[PDB]
Design a protein around this ligand. Structure first.
Ligand code: CL
Ligand code: CL
Length: 234
């Protein structure tokens, strides 16, 4: 019934916030922002010409390109607050968007506290300490679509639509958006396999449960800590 997988709760909150922002702007007279909520998503991306940094912005999906080149791909966010390539690209002349970097950043920060597994956080911190900008997944490498290993992946090499293994809030198997296909493109090379280091980072996290409790993971912190059953007479 319920899957061991990220609910993408941060991204969901950002999209709803962006839908509210577009509606406010519509009420201020900004005609192009008067749209149903299905047209509005939050993406972290470049904007129009000269808007060349990654910022959180509210986009009208009817203005996004189906594909992107270098530079102009859009990014979504995992539940540990990392931005990862999502389908689509910014039309640099024609984009219909509203940049809202402060409020959306604040919502990401708040959402990280709720939704980010401390075991995943540890793995991500290891990777970023060692290789700035990278995050941890147990996923595919270059030119091999079967084998998985814990690696520090450059975020631009991940696909938000592809789920890959990450650490649950009990340090158990979970799956998160931002994965590899194991294909053989240049981007498929952009990672550092670190089995021992990531595993050590994961193993170093203190359990939220006592040693007389069983940790059952959840998609939001904290996990369930159930009293382990006794050596009962059955
Ligand atoms: Cl996630
Ligand atoms: Cl803002």
């Amino acid at each position: 019934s319920h899957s061991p997988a990220s609910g993408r709760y941060i991204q969901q909150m950002l999209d709803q916030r962006c839908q509210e922002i577009a509606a406010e702007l519509c009420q201020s007279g900004l005609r192009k922002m008067c749209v149903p909520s299905s047209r509005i998503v939050a993406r972290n991306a470049v904007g129009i010409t000269h808007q060349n940094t990654l910022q959180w912005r509210c986009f009208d999906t009817a203005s996004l390109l189906e594909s992107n080149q270098e530079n102009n791909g859009v990014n979504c966010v995992d539940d540990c607050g990392h931005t990862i390539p999502c389908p689509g690209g910014v039309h640099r002349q024609n984009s219909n968007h509203a940049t809202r970097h402060e409020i959306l950043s604040k919502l990401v920060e708040e959402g990280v506290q709720r939704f980010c597994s401390p075991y995943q956080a540890s793995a991500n911190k290891y990777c970023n300490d060692k290789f700035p900008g990278t995050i941890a997944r147990r996923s595919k490498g270059f030119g091999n679509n079967v084998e998985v290993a814990w690696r520090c992946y450059e975020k631009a090499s991940l696909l938000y639509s592809v789920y890959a293994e990450c650490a649950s809030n009990c340090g158990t198997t979970w799956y998160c958006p931002g994965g590899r296909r194991g294909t053989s493109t240049e981007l498929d090379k952009r990672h550092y396999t670190e089995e021992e280091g990531i595993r050590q980072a994961i193993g170093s996290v203190d359990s939220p449960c006592s040693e007389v409790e069983v940790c059952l993971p959840k998609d939001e912190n904290p996990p369930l800590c159930l009293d382990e059953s006794g050596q009962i007479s059955r």
